[PDB]
Amino acid sequence: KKRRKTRKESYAIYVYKVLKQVHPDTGISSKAMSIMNSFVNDVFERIAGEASRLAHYNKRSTITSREIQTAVRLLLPGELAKHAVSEGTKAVTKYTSAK
């Protein structure tokens, strides 16, 4: 069973996990989950796009975490940006200090 399968991946399962961590007794309609998927896709593209330009401006062939950071700074509203950088640095540390 591999024919009409052509995988249609989405962020939906990872959205759902995050939902329960914050509202474990709250659920979510299909249409709603779809909006959320569009949301992550949209933001992915914005950040990635800006990070890309950054690298090109500075004649670099590599998008690093530094680029993702400046990108976020450029793209998110002050306070939302502040927390994002915080969350960002955190996961990159936790990851380096890991196995």
């Binding site: 914050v22 509202h23 959320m36 933001v43 690093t64 998110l76 002050g78 960002g88 955190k90 196995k99």
Partner: protein, 106 residues
């Protein structure tokens, strides 16, 4: 597969996928190891933030399942999220209740 990079980073969002998506994205010739970690974290956080507010909005309306309306009230009632999604339209979101005062009786 020993340990997923998401769990190494302490995240629910798929680091591996985000990394793959960056390369095929044609964003740069190359991609550092920290970048998908960082970005995946950033998406995760923002997702939480919206579900958080949107959740609350479900409560407020006597409901336990989030529908679009809830995400719309979530976003429009939040100065910053509303700015970020200022050129975005949430389907089936309706609008916040707001009547200009000069239209009010007497």
């Amino acid at each position: 597969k020993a340990k997923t990079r998401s769990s190494r980073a302490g995240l629910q969002f798929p680091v591996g996928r985000v990394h793959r998506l960056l390369r095929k994205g044609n964003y740069a010739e190359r991609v550092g190891a920290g970048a998908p970690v960082y970005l995946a974290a950033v998406l995760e956080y923002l997702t939480a933030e919206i579900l958080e507010l949107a959740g609350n909005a479900a409560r407020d309306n006597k409901k336990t399942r989030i529908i679009p309306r809830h995400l719309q009230l979530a976003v429009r009632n939040d100065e910053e999220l509303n700015k970020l999604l200022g050129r975005v339209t949430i389907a089936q979101g309706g609008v916040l209740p707001n009547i200009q005062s000069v239209l009010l009786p007497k």
